[PDB]
Structure formats: C-alpha cells, structure tokens
Amino acid sequence: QPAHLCFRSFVEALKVDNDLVEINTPIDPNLEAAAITRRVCETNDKAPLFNNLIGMKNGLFRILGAPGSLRKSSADRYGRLARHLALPPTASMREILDKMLSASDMPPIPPTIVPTGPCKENSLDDSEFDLTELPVPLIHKSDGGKYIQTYGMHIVQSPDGTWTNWSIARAMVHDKNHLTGLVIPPQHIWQIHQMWKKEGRSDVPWALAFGVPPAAIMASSMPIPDGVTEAGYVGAMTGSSLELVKCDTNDLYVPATSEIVLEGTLSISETGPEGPFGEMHGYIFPGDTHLGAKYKVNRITYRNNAIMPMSSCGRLTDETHTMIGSLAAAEIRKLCQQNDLPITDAFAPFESQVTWVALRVDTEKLRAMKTTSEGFRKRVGDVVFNHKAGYTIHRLVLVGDDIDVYEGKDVLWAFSTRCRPGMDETLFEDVRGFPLIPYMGHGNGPAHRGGKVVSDALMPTEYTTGRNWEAADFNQSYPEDLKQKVLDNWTKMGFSHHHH
Amino acid sequence: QPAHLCFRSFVEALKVDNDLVEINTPIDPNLEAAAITRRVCETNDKAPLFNNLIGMKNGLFRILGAPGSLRKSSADRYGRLARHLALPPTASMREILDKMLSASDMPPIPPTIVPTGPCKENSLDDSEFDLTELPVPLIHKSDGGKYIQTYGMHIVQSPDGTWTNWSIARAMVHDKNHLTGLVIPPQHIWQIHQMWKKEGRSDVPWALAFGVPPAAIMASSMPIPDGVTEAGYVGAMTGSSLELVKCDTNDLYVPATSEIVLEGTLSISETGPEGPFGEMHGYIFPGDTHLGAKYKVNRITYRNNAIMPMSSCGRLTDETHTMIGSLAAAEIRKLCQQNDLPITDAFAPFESQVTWVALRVDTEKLRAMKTTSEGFRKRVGDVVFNHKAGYTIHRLVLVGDDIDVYEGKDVLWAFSTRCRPGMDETLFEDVRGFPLIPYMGHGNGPAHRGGKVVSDALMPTEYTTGRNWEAADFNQSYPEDLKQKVLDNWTKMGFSHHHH
Numbered sequence A, B: 001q002p003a004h005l006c007f008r009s010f011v012e013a014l015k016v017d018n019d020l021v022e023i024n025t026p027i028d029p030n031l032e033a034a035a036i037t038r039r040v041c042e043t044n045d046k047a048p049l050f051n052n053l054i055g056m057k058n059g060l061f062r063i064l065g066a067p068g069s070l071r072k073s074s075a076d077r078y079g080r081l082a083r084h085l086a087l088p089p090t091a092s093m094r095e096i097l098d099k100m101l102s103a104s105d106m107p108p109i110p111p112t113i114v115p116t117g118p119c120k121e122n123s124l125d126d127s128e129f130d131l132t133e134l135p136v137p138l139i140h141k142s143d144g145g146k147y148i149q150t151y152g153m154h155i156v157q158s159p160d161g162t163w164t165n166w167s168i169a170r171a172m173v174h175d176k177n178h179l180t181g182l183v184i185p186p187q188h189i190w191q192i193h194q195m196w197k198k199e200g201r202s203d204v205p206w207a208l209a210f211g212v213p214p215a216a217i218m219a220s221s222m223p224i225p226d227g228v229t230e231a232g233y234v235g236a237m238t239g240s241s242l243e244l245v246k247c248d249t250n251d252l253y254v255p256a257t258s259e260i261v262l263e264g265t266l267s268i269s270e271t272g273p274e275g276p277f278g279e280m281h282g283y284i285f286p287g288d289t290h291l292g293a294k295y296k297v298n299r300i301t302y303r304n305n306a307i308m309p310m311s312s313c314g315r316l317t318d319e320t321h322t323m324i325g326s327l328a329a330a331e332i333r334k335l336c337q338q339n340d341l342p343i344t345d346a347f348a349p350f351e352s353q354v355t356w357v358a359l360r361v362d363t364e365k366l367r368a369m370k371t372t373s374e375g376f377r378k379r380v381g382d383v384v385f386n387h388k389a390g391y392t393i394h395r396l397v398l399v400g401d402d403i404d405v406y407e408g409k410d411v412l413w414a415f416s417t418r419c420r421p422g423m424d425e426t427l428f429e430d431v432r433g434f435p436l437i438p439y440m441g442h443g444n445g446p447a448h449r450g451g452k453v454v455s456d457a458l459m460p461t462e463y464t465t466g467r468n469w470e471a472a473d474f475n476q477s478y479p480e481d482l483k484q485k486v487l488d489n490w491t492k493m494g495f496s497h498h499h500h
C-alpha cells in the first residue's frame, strides 16, 4: 500500500528516507520515550521508532514519535509532511498547503467499505483489556494523566447520519475502560456532541483510530468546513476512495489499515478530570485539572505488531506547529479568497508559536479596491475572526507582495518596520478567543473572548499608487550585473551546499 | 598600540583572528565595495579590506567594511565587537554591554594632549583636496549622494567649552569642500548645534575623524548622558587616558591615531540636499531628498596608507543593529535601574530590526512592589519613552526571569504567548517618535510623535505569588537524571561542536 494511504507503509518510507531511528532496546513509556521525542523535535532530528516499549504486551504497542515534525536540512525541511501526501520530499510549504486545499473544489470521493483489513488482526473485548495496563506514555512530567491520544483520529457522526467527522483532539486514560479528553467549541467533535445532547437519547457512538492513513490524519488536523465528511475530502485529495472496515460493536467505519482502534461511546452526560497537558504554546500549568469529556471503551482491535504514533508537543517544533498552524493558515487563505479579499498566501509563523497568521496581499487588486487601512483591516478581521478557521489565530499580519509569508524572518521584518503600533492595528474584543494560549486562559481577561488583532504591515502607497521603496539589501540595492560579478568572484576573493 | 586604542592595530587583530579578507585587486567604490560588504553582513562572513580602491590617490584611501558586524560561529559571534573593547573574542553580549556601562559610575579619565601622531603624517589644505575626487563610496544604488561618513566620529564642543561630544551621524559629499548630513533632535550633535545657533555669532567648530580608536567609536554610538564628554567616559572604561592631537585649523582635539581627519565648520545657517540613504531598518525611499545640515571642510590630515571604515547598512546584520540597538538597550537598562525599576537585562532583538527592547524583570522585586500590569507598564514607558535613550525604540517587551533577552527566539516566544494584544499593552502617543522607521516617517501618522507601546509579557502570577507554569520543553518537563540519560545515550541510539 502507498505511504500516504497506510501508516505501516509510511513508517517504511521514513526508514527508506534515512529519516527514522529504530530503537530496539527497552524504553520506558513513563517520560523516556517522550523525552527522546521532545529532543528530536527541538533539534529537527530523525523520527524515533520505539520497538521495545517497557510494558508492551500481546502486541500493544510500539511507538513512533515526531511523525509530522521537521527535518534538519532546508531542502527537505517538510519532507515528513510531504510523505503524508505522496508529494516529493522537497515539496514547499505552498505545495503542501495547495495539496491540502485541492479537494475544496472537487466532488467528494466517498469511502469504499471492505469486509476486513489489518486492523482486525487482533481484538480484545471488554473482559480482556485494561487501559491502565497498556504502555501509555507520560509525555510531560506534570501531565495530569497518560495521554494515549495525541495523533489518532476521533470518528463521530451526526445523529442523522449525514456527516461523519474525523479530527484530532487529545485524550488521556481515566480508568481501565474510559478516557477523558478535550471537547470544546467550536470544534466539530463538540458540534456533533451537542447534536446528540440535544436529542438526549443516547451517548455518541465513537471510535478512535491510531496509525491511520497519513493523508487522513492531515485532514483530521485541518478545519475543513462544517458538515463536510473528511473521508470524502481525503478521497478527492488523493484521487482514490479510502477503504474502511465497520467497527465490531457499532456501525462506524474505520480505515482498514488502522494500527489500533478503540470502539465505544462519548458520553452526553458524564465528565471526568482531564489535564493538565504540556500544550502547543509551550507551557503546562501543573495542577490545572478541569472536567473534560468522558469516553467509554468497549473493544480494542489492532494490527499485529501495532505502532502508536505520538506527538511530544510543546516548544518548537512539532505537529502542533507544523500541522495545526499551517493547515489553519491554508483554510484562512481560502476563506479570505472566497470573501473576495485579495489574499494570495497565508502561513502561521513558527516564531509566533503559530498564534499569528501572515496574509500576503495582491496589492494590484488592493489598489483597485480604493480602500484604506482601517477599512481593510476591519473587513479582514471580521471575515477571519468570526469563522472557525480563525479560532486558533490571535494576530493577523497583512503584508504586501514583496514578503514571502513562509519565511518567518521576512514576516518579522515587515511587521516590525511597516505596522505602527496602535494606529495601524484594529483590536477585536467581541470574537471567540483561544483559551489554550497562556495570555487567554491564564491571563488578565476573559479566557474565551477577545484578545485578537489585525496588524496592517502594508505601507500607505500600497493602497494607492504602488510600493515606493527598495530594500537596503544585496538583492535590491545593487544592479544585476554587479550582483552576479560579486557572486562569481566570491570564493576567488576569499569568502565562504543546497542539499546539505 | 593595542587594538582597542588604535584602528590600525584593530585591522591587524581582525587579520590575526582569521576574520579579515584582504582584497588587493581593483574594487570600484561605486557600489562594488558596498555590495561585497552587504553580502558579508547578510552572511556573517569575514570583514573585507579593500586595499586597491579605484580612484585612491595620494594615500586616500583604502576601505574596511563591516567593522562591527557578526561572525558566523556562535562561540565568537560578537568577536568583532569584543575586539573594539579588549575583551576576549568569546565575550557574551551581557559582558560587552557591561563593559560599555562600566564607566557610568567611575570618575572620567580626561584625555592627554600630545604634540603629534600618525593622523598628521599627511595633509591637504583647502587648495589641494576635492571631496568629489576621492573614492567615496556609493553604498546603495538609489542613495542621494556618496556617503563618506558611515563610521567616523563627529567632534563638536559646547560654546562654553565644558562638553565635547563624540558621535556617529551620517554624511555625504555635497561638493568639493562641503558635506551634508543628518543632524536631528534629540541627538547630542543637534543639541550642541542649537547652542551655537542661539549664540548666533559663528558656525560650529567641527572635526570628523575616521578610523578612530575602536573603544571610542563604540562610545560614539552609545547614548551616554547629556553633558558627558565621551573621551573621559572611554578613558574610564579602558582604564587609560586617550591621546589626542589638536586640529591644525581649530582648537578641537582628535585621536592621535585617527586614519583620516576632516577639519572645518558645521553651519548654523546653511543647509543642502541630503539623502535618501539605505537605512538601518532595511529600506531606501528613492528620491526622498530633504535638506540637511551643511559642513564645510577646510583641511584633511591622514595616516600613510589611510583606511576608511564603512558600514554598508540595511537589512540584518550590520553596525546599525549590533551597535545602535545593543548600546541603546544597555543605556535603557541602566536608566530603568536608576529609576528604581527591577530590570536586570535589556537587549534590542535583531528580529525586531532593533525597534524593540526586551526588558528582563527581577520578579521577586516586582512582587514586593505589589503593583499591577497597567501601573507597571505605564511607569516603565514613562521612564524610557520620555528619555533620549529610548528614542530609537518603539516597543518595550517586559519579560520575567526565565527569558534570556539576548536570545530572540525566546523573546519572540514570550511576546507571542504571554502578552494579550490590547489588554496587556499601553500605547504612548505623546512621546517623541523615531522618524527613520518606515511606519513613522513614511506612515499613516505624525512622523515625529507617538507610535510607541509597552507590551507586558509578564504573566499574572509574576506580580503576586510567582511563576505557575513549567515549559513544555526538554529542559523543564523531564527530571535531571532522565535528561542526562537521554543525552548520554543520544549518539549510541543513532541521533546526531561548540567552536564550529
């Protein structure tokens, strides 16, 4: 099976790419696996595959850390992400995001039901498993539980059957047969849960599939529109119908090659302690436990020699930056274009801890609008900050055509030199805020409202007659023939490879 | 003579350090020298010494580019600056700034007058030189003149004789015997000029010395207090009295080992076209010429085989970042401490194009103040933004003790995650603004007023009971013994030098 359609094949791809380290000696799921993974993510090293996890029994489980993190080289920086999508390992961020957006104006390709698959190789009923006996990692030393779920896909369906959502949301072990996790507005898992709560008749049928097709886990991390079934979006993206097998204990459908599947229910009535967890913005607040959603597990099915993917998330750079930020930025780019705004590109700078998105403006189109900074900032912020795709983003930075938004140094340059604090900004206090950012949930104001800003780093003439500067850099402040002469004589004079 | 006391010795030091490239083939001062220098600064390469400048005649002149720019290695990143100050080449930024501040609570050591020095080896009277015939560089292709003066020291004295100021301010050739340059408030050259204008009797006696003692050019770039003679500050810093020789045509005193000295007057009545120039924030606005101050040159004296230092300034990283930003930050640190504010460290992040300063707070002392963010932000901004040391800085970022302000990634992290836009900020509109920032002088508001902000990246409990988080990083979210085990087994497992 291709790497983008089968997690086991993806792990082989990373090996073949010399982007894997197999660790075959015993590693402790209590902190050690995650510490190694953390170090990998902070240094852009090879992904670790822990083949000998202390406490693995009956095939459950190995761990792959850092599945969507960065490679050291510039040339294949995003290669792990490219390997989720059948793209060359040298693919640019633009190419990755374009691939993720490509299904937005294609007909869905619905999934195909098959009778069995590798995820059915082994099973454990409700008398045979105990989630407290599995080698579930403690990811950070102050976490409030062992977070089994950092890179699996939750599957829930609307009561009427018309929408099946796939998404990533964290969850930790509560007891032998329950998890607790985050289920918060405006996320689709929460929207669907609310539908079942209003019906009031039963708990939500649920499955959680770990080690799903890589193309599926990418869509699971993207805020595609309300009501859109991720399986059909992924089908269209990849040009192939995904093969799914029915759960044993409910009528949901899981990817046939899933490494591990939990089947059960998401309660419409019960909660339990959840968190704290070392989160995407780089912090944990020890002791901050709150009630979360409660999941009951009725059955486990799994592949022979099952592998659990794990995100050891926190400070830069891991899946919470590469996937959450970039994929939200992609959706925001599309949203802006569909609202007739002249945005060509969007990216969430890693330097901003993916709390900013830089929006590149087609300034020719902006000039034709015959508008002003105040008006344009308000328009952009109204579109983005009132939409779910803008949920995680607290600062939008508008930049002109000279800025590559995929280059954080250039975004930072433009922000710092082109946006006058206060005057060139519009604050938004009556929008949904993202409580996970420390200055929100642990800050001075309402955890769930406000704290957003549009920062206009367009210069005044970009609205009127055109750019009126040249950069004071090698590229722009010297003629072509001189630049080339300098380059050609560089090593000859005495001064100091792309792949590396 | 020691490197910090003699520019010729400094050039030898850079050679000896393998931090110089001597270029002995012909190089054009029209753009080529500056393009090479620009490339050096953008790549942290070795400083270029142009020994064969097209148009050099009678000893005037060679050029040294990038005298205060960065080295590639992390271990000796700031070594060129260290070589200005007799510090080891591995000195930290903290150590460099502490050296620059050290004379602030020492008695001055006044200069010593000597009868002659190397700067008197050659002379040209007012019938013998023509500034349009010298190999003065065109630094950026759209500059409005040939900027002879990018790394020399202007010398002017108050009418009453009590204060002699040394400072860097740009100047370009106007005609055979005049320069035009920037002379703007609140700079000391401007303050002294205003004194002479109010007296109304004569033009200002002036000298401009190029290739001065390196320790002197550092103080020339620092906003030490009003009324303080830089020569005595440098004397105290270095522990030695600087040796100065009298000008021939006026009674000012110049460093004895100056490479090149211009003697003349700064007009109290005349102006001429000045600029545009590719400036510190990374921009030039072609055609934006304005009237500047006008200097008359009456005499040139110079060393045999004189060397002119040159800053090819613009985008990161050059002397306008390493010296202007860092030295302003140093002075701001001291100013805050002298106003009883609990600031331990200050730095202007390069990522901010040195328009921000991050202020590290001793949060134990802050807690004892029993204050709030609003109150503290207002206090800090009032102190800094109403002082000349704060002139160039538009955003102050307050951070707690866990943040190393000399590390831009950590400042950016703290700003992005701990300061809620709007609520955790105070805007200052009734302060002097820095017009050279594009969003000021070429922006939507007054060029000379406002546009400043204090951004509080202190978390709420930092004011009350203490930090209440741990970072989700390798350092903080794993115990010591596990961290060490991981490090010790890193290469063994299969994962990947300080000097490199």
Ligand SMILES: Cc1cc2c3c(c1C)C(C)(C)C[C@H]1C=C(c4ccccc4)[C@]4(C(=O)NC(=O)N=C4N2C[C@H](O)[C@H](O)[C@H](O)COP(=O)(O)O)N31
Pocket (backbone or CB within 6 Å): A149, A150, A151, A165, A166, A167, A168, A169, A170, A171, A182, A183, A184, A186, A187, A188, A189, A220, A221, A222, A223, A224, A279, A280, A311, A313, A319, A320, A323, A324, A392, A436
């Ligand atoms: C890639 C990735 C995504 C997420 C997370 C993680 C990883 C690795 C971990 C490591 C588990 C950290 C937590 C931290 C998370 C967090 C919480 C809220 C917002 C963003 C992140 C969370 C989570 O617990 N809850 C959540 O509601 N969304 C999460 N997302 C974002 C989420 O997958 C996207 O938003 C997506 O668009 C959902 O689909 P849909 O609803 O549009 O169909 N989660």
Ligand SMILES: Cc1cc2c3c(c1C)C(C)(C)C[C@H]1C=C(c4ccccc4)[C@]4(C(=O)NC(=O)N=C4N2C[C@H](O)[C@H](O)[C@H](O)COP(=O)(O)O)N31
Pocket (backbone or CB within 6 Å): B149, B150, B151, B165, B166, B167, B168, B169, B170, B171, B182, B183, B184, B186, B187, B188, B189, B220, B221, B222, B223, B224, B279, B280, B311, B313, B319, B320, B323, B324, B392, B436
């Ligand atoms: C290191 C360095 C410093 C400066 C400059 C340059 C270099 C290389 C060049 C490349 C020539 C670019 C221009 C761009 C400059 C610029 C203009 C205004 C503010 C900052 C920079 C300027 C300039 O033209 N005018 C100016 O008033 N101050 C300058 N400074 C700052 C100045 O040396 C300090 O502020 C110092 O504290 C002065 O002494 P004092 O008055 O306190 O005694 N200048």
Ligand SMILES: [K+]
Pocket (backbone or CB within 6 Å): A166, A167, A168, A219, A220, A221, A222, A223, A224, A230
């Ligand atoms: K999704």
Ligand SMILES: [K+]
Pocket (backbone or CB within 6 Å): A418, A419, A420, A424, A456, A457, A458, A459, A460, B439
């Ligand atoms: K602007």
Ligand SMILES: [K+]
Pocket (backbone or CB within 6 Å): B166, B167, B168, B219, B220, B221, B222, B223, B224, B230
């Ligand atoms: K000075």
Ligand SMILES: [K+]
Pocket (backbone or CB within 6 Å): A439, B418, B419, B420, B424, B456, B457, B458, B459, B460
């Ligand atoms: K704050």
Ligand SMILES: [Mn+2]
Pocket (backbone or CB within 6 Å): A165, A166, A167, A188, A223, A224, A225, A228, A230
């Ligand atoms: Mn969805």
Ligand SMILES: [Mn+2]
Pocket (backbone or CB within 6 Å): B165, B166, B167, B188, B223, B224, B225, B228, B230
């Ligand atoms: Mn001064």
